[PDB]
Design a protein around this ligand. Structure first.
Ligand SMILES: *[C@@H]1O[C@H](CO)[C@@H](O[C@@H]2O[C@H](CO)[C@@H](O[C@@H]3O[C@H](CO[C@H]4O[C@H](CO[C@H]5O[C@H](CO)[C@@H](O)[C@H](O)[C@@H]5O[C@H]5O[C@H](CO)[C@@H](O)[C@H](O)[C@@H]5O)[C@@H](O)[C@H](O[C@H]5O[C@H](CO)[C@@H](O)[C@H](O)[C@@H]5O)[C@@H]4O)[C@@H](O)[C@H](O)[C@@H]3O)[C@H](O)[C@H]2NC(C)=O)[C@H](O)[C@H]1NC(C)=O
Ligand SMILES: OC[C@H]1O[C@@H](O[C@@H]2[C@@H](O)[C@H](O[C@@H]3[C@@H](O)[C@H](O[C@@H]4[C@@H](O)[C@H](O[C@@H]5[C@@H](O)[C@H](O[C@@H]6[C@@H](O)[C@H](O[C@@H]7[C@@H](O)[C@@H](O)O[C@H](CO)[C@H]7O)O[C@H](CO)[C@H]6O)O[C@H](CO)[C@H]5O)O[C@H](CO)[C@H]4O)O[C@H](CO)[C@H]3O)O[C@H](CO)[C@H]2O)[C@H](O)[C@@H](O)[C@@H]1O
Length: 298
């Protein structure tokens, strides 16, 4: 469980080690994903000093017949198999309609190269969800050692209604306005051939491993306590369902999950998701990631 520093991304480093994907939203959201040149001119991406900002447009009222709300989706140039990824996150997007994620995938053969969500939710609904999506023959035992709570235990996208196999973080400050109020915190994900684990440490935690908080060149996950989410290989050959994955950090709106009326409305958001996102730009002034660092160890 000992790893050594492979990549250390801070501020402007993200501009040369990740790309912006100006792509049609694969989850069909009310979003216009812009390229890196456009992101920078329009200040949707700001990457300077010890800060990366990734945000949505919070000034434009959308044309109902035009493209969605301007936002960004960044993807690491490098891919990883057995590794630990540590995200020091000060702020994540909030707002009705928002659907932010920090995750890993191989887009080129989805779902067969797998996907793991480290940070994800919709419509400001805490807590955080940590979820795997795979092809066939991957499930999770009903009970295993973690602080979080499992919801769906079948990871196979074709037989699970695309929910994946997920775990809910135990605290509200894992996600959303609550996370943001607390100054964020740290997410760490360890992936091996045998398992995937995610740990969350709130910004104010008295027990955050120095490994995680200070980012030295050597880490040891044995010292990190029980994971928030645990995906063992009891009923899933982990290595055979995941290949080399890029890291992706993005913000979409509405679409296949967040945009469902029951979900959007069930979260206390008014009206329809698309109309809300069209007509309330100032409601997304806080729809930003503020990232202090992402580090990868191998
Ligand atoms: C495009 O978009 C960008 C990004 O949004 C816009 O940039 C912002 O521009 C505005 C207006 O010019 C700036 O607002 C001003 O900020 C002034 C103070 O700035 C300084 O402090 C900021 C806060 O720092 C503290 O908090 C952070 C955690 O979030 C810590 O890292 C840091 O150590 C500080 O902690 C102290 O305080 C806390 C308690 O609050 C304690 O607990 C700690 O112990 C510390 O005592 C900080 O965000 C700024 O950092 C920026 O600049 C430095 C270099 O100077 C760089 O290294 C960083 O990477 C970062 O870029 C800075 O240190 C304030 O005086 C003034 O009144 C006003 O509010 C704002 O700083 C910008 N935000 C940035 C840069 O992130 C940009 O304007 C926009 N372009 C457009 C529209 O054209
Ligand atoms: O539980 C947490 C979990 O929730 C998931 O949302 C679920 C909803 O998807 C589900 O709604 C059903 C509709 O999806 C369905 O509409 C069909 C379309 O989905 C389909 O398009 C497919 C594409 O979406 C797919 O593209 C891939 C993306 O899905 C993938 O998305 C990422 C996720 O994998 C995730 O983990 O993280 C990130 C960040 O948040 C997501 O971006 O990304 C990859 C790589 O880029 C894409 O390839 O590609 C396939 C082809 O391979 C397409 O089929 O299109 C068909 C038309 O043919 C539609 O039928 O309709 C149903 C009925 O209306 C609807 O129920 O609902 C449940 C709620 O019960 C949600 O749980 C999130 O997607 C997931 O992110 C999250 O972890």
């Amino acid at each position: 469980a000992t790893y050594h520093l492979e990549d250390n991304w801070v501020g402007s480093a993200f501009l040369s080690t990740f790309t912006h994907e100006a792509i049609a939203d694969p989850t069909h959201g009310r979003v216009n994903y812009v390229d890196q040149a456009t992101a920078l001119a329009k200040n949707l991406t700001y990457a300077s000093g010890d800060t990366l900002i990734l945000r949505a447009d919070h000034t434009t009222t959308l044309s109902p017949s035009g493209p969605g709300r301007n936002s960004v989706r960044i993807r690491s140039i490098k891919t990883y198999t057995t590794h630990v990824a540590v995200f020091d996150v000060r702020h994540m997007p909030q707002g009705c309609g928002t659907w932010p994620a920090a995750w890993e995938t191989d887009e080129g053969d989805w779902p067969n190269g797998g996907s793991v969500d480290i940070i994800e939710g919709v419509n400001d609904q805490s807590p955080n969800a940590m979820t795997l999506h795979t092809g066939a023959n991957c499930a999770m035992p009903a009970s295993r050692t973690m602080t979080g709570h499992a919801t769906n235990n079948n990871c196979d996208v074709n037989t699970d209604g695309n929910t994946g196999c997920g775990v809910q973080a135990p605290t509200a400050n894992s996600y959303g306005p609550s996370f943001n109020a607390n100054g964020g915190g740290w997410y760490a994900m360890e992936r091996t051939n045998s398992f995937i684990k995610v740990w969350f440490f709130p910004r104010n935690a008295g027990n955050v491993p120095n490994d995680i908080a200070s980012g030295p060149a050597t880490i040891n996950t044995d010292n990190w306590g029980t994971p928030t989410a645990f995906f063992p290989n009891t009923n899933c050959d982990i290595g055979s369902h995941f290949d080399a994955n890029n890291i992706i950090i993005n913000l979409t709106f509405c679409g296949d999950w967040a945009g469902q009326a029951s979900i959007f409305n069930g979260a206390g958001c008014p009206g329809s998701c698309v109309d809300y996102v069209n007509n309330n730009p100032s409601a997304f002034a806080n729809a930003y990631w503020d990232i202090a660092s992402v580090r990868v160890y191998q």
